[PDB]
């Protein structure tokens, strides 16, 4: 008080360590997008349950070899074949059709010739196999993909579209997954107006609340809009009390930061009895960033107090909030993805570790993507035909490196799905 | 008939060209995620509307330089200041607070010292200030009348906030494509059902829906449809009336049982652009368009093979859907990566579901063909085998198509 300048490295690990992992719940598989399995998933069937043809052709005997064969019928999809392949006989099969007994190989239609058909010309009767087949050729044996009783999905798996389809395959329509964090977002400041309102003297429109919510919703977490809150202990405590009762995470933006006008941290410590882990982070932007946890009824809520500056709000949210949210929803490695890219613009370095919204662009035969830094607020909006999907990670300036130039390999954090 | 083997290159550009761009509609700015602006957006205000302090400190006169100063008052946020900074005087300001007349520079509190005082009275400025220091002049961020968002912009969280900044809460954007998904095949059961002889569970419909839903497009579940012209026609007719895009999976591609292509041609009189694509997997992939009432619906017939379905859906459907919702470049992002495993090459251009992982201090990511804890976010793009290149080895630079969150 004033809080010590916490290093960027320590501030990040503090958030993750103090961030809890939510409990679990049972959901339907169709709602499993982005969910993390808290259970092993076992298959109760074989895939395929029956020998299935890979190609459109004929179920044949390899020992019969090439030559003229009788077509005893066709194996239909969804039906266990009733006829048995005798020597000299074949059965027409399509891709996915069950293989009849007696057959041990499938010759595709491209390696065949239709010899003779019925007098009506409506039925195939005799076919010539032009090739020699190996036993098991173009056949998916029982359980080739999935064996019965086999673990197809382990606990801790972060599920996508394919993992949902896999659940549908094995027939497990109900799974145990971690809950999603409910995120409440509010804005503080006596100068803030709703975006729907016209400007008044000394007033600006609240943009952080819209951006923050949009950022969380992009990750698919449920959000709560607590609206604009006056910068005073009474209104802050009411908003925080509402957010705590309704959400697992409470994000606020604005506030008069440090000093004796620091209502935010006064309410947190004195009224709320919350533990403030840090109030200042040696970074740019987002120096006045506050992170706190609160334990109620054995449940830990986390509270982010982000800077009022619009650029700082989105940057700090991607750096601290999102990794914390990913941890709460059960992701084993909640850390952000950091890739290598080349600078599209020269940039002066700051004594503090600096982060810039940027646009990542991959080219045709170029191995590394080009990261064009967005100056901050408006610069990109002349070339913003694409949304900023990256976060340029600039090192703190030293006597060695005071300025970075065009083409150098730098760290960029992917902050949005491409 | 059987449809000519369309090259993978031609099949892709055909889908995009034949795929239309949807009309526009008015939405609230809070619903603008992933939307494309069909209009320019101009600012009607200055940002900031007033000169604002960057630091928490005191508004000073640069001409006065360092020395002892009188605190005439404090500039509150949301209030227009009434006092004027005279020589030898300063005013306490917070970050974002309006700058009073008379002051041309801001000295942060770290460069000051309380001399004499619920109210402060005197302070010493310890440094010399440059005119305009730590001050955001009127319109420094956004000037009035300036175009802040051009039409064609694919909006994200920041664009939503920019809309909220300028006060444009209603914007004109392209519609999102409504996509109907159905599965065909007499062997298909619902995932809730136990297996019957010769039957498997329908997984394609779940995967395809989840794929489309991930991009935020509204979807319609047409369920399982029998492999016969009557049921197919009913399902297609329903999908056509209710959706812009109809996706089907399964069904006999080749033979004469091609009920799907029979219905499309005979009953619906739709134009089939290709029925086969020289690719692995997804050879029996069909793309058709249908013009009803001056409106073009698009139809995808994906292979029944589960792996083929998800691959063809990311290669053809998603780029088509992005074009419909107004995205200027609907082409997927392709990156260079290293192979995590050796792989035999196929005469056909091959595609594998893979997982992109960036290792520390390593410029290129590694792609691992289907760790198991993570969902596949990439689609490995293997080249067709030619000459000396019969096989690709571990460490070689290959193309990977981003299909998920990195």
């Amino acid at each position: 008080s004033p809080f010590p300048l916490t290093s960027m490295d320590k501030a990040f690990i503090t958030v993750l360590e103090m961030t809890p992992v939510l409990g679990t719940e049972i959901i339907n598989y169709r709602d499993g997008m982005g969910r993390v399995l808290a259970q092993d998933v076992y298959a109760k069937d074989n895939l395929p349950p029956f020998p299935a043809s890979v190609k459109d052709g004929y179920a044949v005997r390899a020992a019969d070899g090439p030559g003229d064969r009788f077509i005893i019928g066709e194996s239909q999809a969804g039906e266990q074949p009733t006829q048995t392949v005798m020597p000299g006989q074949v059965m027409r099969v399509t891709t996915g059709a069950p293989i009849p007994c007696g057959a041990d190989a499938v010759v595709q239609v491209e390696d065949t010739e239709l010899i003779r058909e019925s007098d009506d010309g409506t039925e195939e009767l005799e076919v010539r196999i032009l090739v020699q087949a190996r036993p098991g050729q173009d056949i998916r044996p029982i359980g080739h993909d999935i064996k019965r009783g086999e673990c197809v999905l382990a606990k801790g798996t972060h599920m996508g579209p394919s993992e949902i389809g896999l659940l549908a395959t094995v027939g497990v329509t109900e799974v145990e997954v971690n809950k999603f964090p409910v995120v409440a977002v509010m804005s503080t400041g006596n100068e803030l107006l709703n975006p729907e309102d016209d400007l008044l003297p000394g007033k600006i429109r609240d943009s952080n609340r819209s951006t923050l919510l949009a950022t969380i919703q992009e990750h698919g977490y449920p959000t709560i809009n607590l609206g604009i809150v006056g910068d005073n202990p009474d209104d802050l405590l009411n908003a925080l009390n509402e957010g705590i009762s309704r959400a697992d995470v409470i994000i606020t933006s604005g506030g008069v930061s440090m000093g004796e006008k620091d209502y935010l941290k006064q309410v947190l410590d004195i009224d709320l009895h919350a533990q403030i882990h840090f109030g200042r982070v040696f970074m740019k932007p987002g120096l006045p960033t506050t992170f706190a946890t609160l334990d109620i009824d054995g449940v830990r809520k986390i509270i982010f107090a982000l800077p009022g500056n619009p650029v700082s709000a989105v940057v700090t949210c991607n750096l601290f909030v999102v990794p914390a949210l990913r941890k709460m929803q059960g992701i084993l490695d909640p850390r952000p993805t950091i890739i290598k890219a080349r600078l599209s613009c020269d940039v002066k370095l700051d004594p503090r570790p600096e982060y810039h919204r940027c646009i990542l662009t991959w080219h045709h035969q170029e191995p590394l993507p080009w990261a064009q830094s967005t100056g901050n607020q408006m610069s990109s909006r002349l070339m913003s035909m694409r949304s900023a999907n990256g976060l340029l990670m600039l090192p703190p300036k030293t006597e060695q490196y005071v300025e970075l130039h065009k083409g150098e390999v730098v760290d960029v954090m992917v902050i949005g799905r491409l | 008939s059987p449809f000519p083997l369309t090259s993978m290159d031609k099949a892709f550009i055909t889908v995009l060209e034949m795929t239309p761009v949807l009309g526009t509609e008015i939405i609230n700015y809070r619903d603008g995620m992933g939307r494309v602006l069909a209009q320019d957006v101009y600012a009607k205000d200055n940002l900031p509307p007033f000169p604002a302090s960057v630091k928490d400190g005191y508004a000073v006169r640069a001409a006065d330089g360092p020395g002892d100063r009188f605190i005439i008052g404090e500039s509150q946020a949301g209030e227009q200041p009434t006092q004027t900074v005279m020589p030898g005087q300063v005013m306490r300001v917070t970050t974002g607070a309006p700058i009073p007349c008379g002051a041309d520079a801001v000295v942060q509190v770290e460069d000051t010292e309380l001399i004499r005082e619920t109210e402060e009275l005197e302070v010493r400025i310890l440094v010399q200030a440059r005119p305009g220091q730590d001050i955001r002049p009127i319109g420094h961020d956004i000037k009035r009348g300036e175009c802040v968002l051009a039409k064609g912009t694919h909006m994200g969280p920041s664009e939503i906030g920019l809309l909220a900044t300028v006060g444009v809460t209603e914007v004109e954007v392209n519609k999102f494509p409504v996509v109907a998904v159905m599965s065909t095949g007499n062997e298909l059961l619902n995932p809730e059902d136990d297996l019957l002889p010769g039957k498997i569970r329908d997984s394609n419909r779940s995967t395809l829906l989840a794929t489309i839903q991930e991009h935020g497009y509204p979807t319609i579940n047409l369920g399982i449809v029998g492999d016969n012209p009557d049921d197919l026609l009913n399902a297609l007719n329903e999908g056509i009336s209710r959706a812009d895009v109809i996706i089907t999976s399964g069904g006999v591609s080749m033979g004469e049982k091609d009920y799907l292509k029979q219905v499309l041609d005979i009953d619906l009189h739709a134009q089939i652009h290709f029925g086969r694509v020289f690719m692995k997997p997804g050879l029996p992939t069909t793309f058709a368009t249908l013009d009803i009432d001056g409106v073009r619906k698009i139809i995808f017939a994906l292979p029944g093979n589960p792996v083929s379905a998800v691959v063809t859906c990311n290669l053809f459907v998603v780029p088509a859907l992005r074009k419909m919702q107004g995205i200027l470049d609907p082409r997927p992002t392709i990156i260079k990566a290293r192979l995590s495993c050796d792989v035999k090459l196929d005469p056909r251009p091959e595609y594998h579901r893979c997982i992109l992982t960036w290792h520390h201090q390593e410029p290129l990511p590694w792609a691992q063909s289907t760790m198991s804890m993570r969902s596949a976010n990439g689609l490995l793009m293997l080249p067709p085998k030619t000459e000396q290149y019969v096989e690709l080895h571990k460490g070689e630079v290959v193309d990977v198509m981003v299909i998920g969150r990195l």
């Binding site: 045709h364 | 993978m8 091959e350 490995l380 793009m381 067709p384 290149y389 290959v398």
Partner: peptide, 9 residues
């Protein structure tokens, strides 16, 4: 740009 995987020795 190509929807087919490219190569480089």
């Amino acid at each position: 740009f190509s929807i087919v995987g490219t190569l480089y020795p």
